[PDB]
Design a binder for this molecule. Structure first.
Ligand code: NA
Length: 506
């Protein structure tokens, strides 16, 4: 039986992996991950269905869309009973281990072993982190706490190596979820990376300074009346929260301020990515010397993408390419296609059924996702989707990003900004409750955005109001309407929202 190590980093976006060939690849940000891809298979079209940490991690654990597993936003939690991925590996006779960033709210009690960050409600600390572990029995969750000195990414790797070396029953296969907290904000990189990239300019995206044709009334207001309201920024654009403010840039020139904030944002972030990559070298080295390299499936992914200043945006949540796409690399030692790429349209909800089938199990019939394990034997899965669904539910909270649904085909992306919160008690409350002058949660404008992701991969040009694209827009609206029906996301429980979305889709 094959062992499995599922490695996932927090907010590690595809621009920041060398193998994905973004503007950042010239910096060689992830040599170890790149080498893994050269001996594995890289997936070009892997998409989150809902880009924030907790909803994505719930989709991964349950194989189910947010509207099915009910973990809609960061405000909801998983139930232990919903730990389906690990239940399935248990039922197949695996010993199971959960290491690192959990962030699902509940105890990882369906694991045989866990040691997961607890600082700041499951967010963890970059230095001297404490962990909740199934080894502390003197106390009950969430109080079975231990503390480790030093840098988190180094400690996380040590927890995994320790379990493999000292705790695993070598007579049984293992399934391990190995989750780094880096490169999540605040990007507190380890001191030894202080001068990494010191002499280099990080390539700047044109869209940081030019948004002329991007967006719509739903993301900008009419005539940009909401340009300082919607969407936190790298520049001074967003009036409440942005990196120019956060990094205290004040050169006398706002464009220079933006450039300097982008450089500090990207360099701090990439120094955290480098710490993860260096740590992967240690882990992979260990697996190789232990004789596990050729009997262990290894996955490397990030729970969602992140806006690294494209369109002058930050964080995730948006359906735009950099936030929707997850990097996703799998090395199955039995797969003969080494260094291959796959363009199959996949979602984070497909991870669990695929892994289960990879080791000989059956695709679970209660999951929304399906298994693409046949790709590793050189065959597209039967009747596989050629489009993906997306919905961000957490209207305006944290980053002033309006709620939206969308569909991405291989050629076009249609986004419907419906601009409502599913819990109308939240209207009027602060979107960022730690700030005295936060904006308030309010309904925003309904609008469509249509991007040609093949000829405009950076989503520079919203086509929804171009009359040359009237038929494409109608065709994609029909597909969005049907896909929403196909996946069961029809809002009978939220009639406020159902009326708005049904009306917009004709
Ligand atoms: Na995340």
């Amino acid at each position: 039986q094959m062992n499995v190590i599922y490695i996932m980093s927090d907010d590690h976006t595809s621009q920041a992996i060398g193998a994905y060939g973004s503007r950042l690849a010239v910096l060689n940000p992830t040599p170890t991950i790149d080498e893994l891809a050269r001996d594995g298979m890289l997936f070009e079209n892997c998409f989150c269905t809902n880009s924030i940490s907790t909803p994505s991690r719930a989709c991964i654990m349950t194989g189910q869309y947010s509207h099915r597993n009910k973990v809609l936003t960061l405000d909801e939690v998983l139930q232990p009973d919903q730990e389906y991925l690990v239940d399935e590996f248990h039922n197949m006779g695996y010993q199971t281990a959960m290491i690192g960033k959990w962030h699902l709210g509940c105890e990882p009690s369906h694991f045989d072993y866990y040691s997961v960050f607890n600082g700041h409600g499951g967010q963890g600390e970059y230095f001297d982190p404490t962990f909740l572990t199934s080894d502390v029995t003197d106390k009950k969750w969430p109080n079975n706490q231990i503390k480790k000195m030093g840098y988190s990414s180094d400690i996380v790797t040590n927890l995994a190596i320790d379990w493999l070396k000292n705790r695993r029953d070598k007579s049984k296969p293992f399934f391990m979820m190995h989750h780094y907290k880096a490169p999540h904000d605040m990007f507190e990189y380890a001191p030894r990376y202080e001068y990494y990239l010191d002499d280099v300019e990080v390539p700047v995206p044109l869209s940081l300074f030019d948004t002329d044709k991007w967006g719509s009334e739903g993301t900008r207001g009419k005539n940009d009346s909401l340009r300082h309201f919607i969407g936190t920024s790298v520049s001074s654009r967003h009036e409440i929260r942005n990196y120019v403010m956060e990094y205290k840039c004040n050169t006398g020139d706002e464009m220079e301020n933006t450039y300097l904030a982008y450089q500090h944002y990207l360099k701090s972030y990439l120094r955290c990515v480098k710490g993860v990559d260096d740590n992967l070298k240690r882990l992979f080295d260990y697996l190789k010397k232990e004789g596990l390299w050729e009997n262990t499936i290894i996955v490397y992914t990030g729970d969602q993408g992140m806006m690294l200043g494209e369109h002058d945006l930050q964080d995730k949540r948006w359906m735009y390419e950099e936030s929707q796409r997850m990097p996703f690399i799998v090395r199955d030692p039995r797969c003969p296609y080494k260094g291959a790429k796959s363009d199959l349209m996949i979602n984070n909800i497909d991870f669990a059924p695929t892994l289960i089938e990879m080791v000989g199990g059956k695709e679970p019939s209660y999951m929304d996702g399906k298994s693409f394990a046949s790709v590793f034997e050189g065959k597209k899965p039967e009747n596989w989707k050629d489009a993906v669904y997306y919905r961000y539910w957490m209207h305006m909270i944290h980053h002033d990003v309006p709620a939206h649904i969308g569909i991405r085909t291989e050629n076009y992306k249609l986004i419907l900004f419906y601009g409502r919160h599913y819990d109308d008690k939240r209207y009027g409350q602060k979107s960022m409750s730690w700030l005295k002058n936060s904006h308030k949660i309010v309904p925003t404008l309904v609008s469509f955005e249509l991007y040609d992701v093949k000829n405009d991969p950076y989503e520079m040009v919203n086509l929804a109001d171009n009359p040359k694209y009237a038929k494409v827009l109608k065709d994609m609206k029909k597909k969005l309407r049907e896909l929403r029906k196909q996946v069961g996301d029809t809002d009978e429980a939220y009639p406020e929202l159902k009326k708005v979305i049904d009306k917009a889709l004709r």
